[PDB]
Amino acid sequence: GHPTEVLCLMNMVLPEELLDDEEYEEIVEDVRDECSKYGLVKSIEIPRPVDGVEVPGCGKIFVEFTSVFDCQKAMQGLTGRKFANRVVVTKYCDPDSYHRRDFW
Template identity: 45%
Template structure:
């Protein structure tokens, strides 16, 4: 599952150098997973997946602790998504000069997006402030696509989270890409498919 997810993410944003999944093997060992890529360049590019959301967690992607090779400059997933969405990052060319078709992100599996680390309990206490947050969220997040509903629980297990339900999975994926890297009152938001 991890091989498929990370491979498709690399392909989606154009960090592969040839068609197909660039990950040769994946070995899980306790809290760690080790992936081996087919080329050195794709291994360097994979470092840009740091902080990618996967199954409710942000993956930390880096070299093994005993790695002694050259240090490769890289960004985080939020940086790469922003560059991809702005057109700074382009897909590799296929034979004949046509751009390779992007593989769909494996994480685009739901119409519902969960936003975490945006709110505090204090934000939800005052009714007026709660309504303002609800309206601001609807206004900001509707730019990515048609919203079916916005839910901001004030109590229970989902308190301090925001749930956005879009009409399509594509709009939900646009929201995650568009919100990547945003901060709220100094807190960096986390955006996941539910």
């Protein structure tokens, strides 16, 4: 709906793929590098799974840009792009919710 400077990338990761530090770090770098083609990436949040503990937003990628315009360019460039034989699905994330790490 309402465009923000925070992009949420869905359908890109399985929780299993975020357990090992090396794999998690590689996903963070790959995400940053792809998003950097559209604007300045201020920060990234990829909630990691903890088996038996609820982790809201796990399986989702949150990328904060330095402007709303750069985020909208990222949403245009990434939405519908094929990744891991799937379809990248997106949404805007509330900036306040992002900073207080209140994901869904």
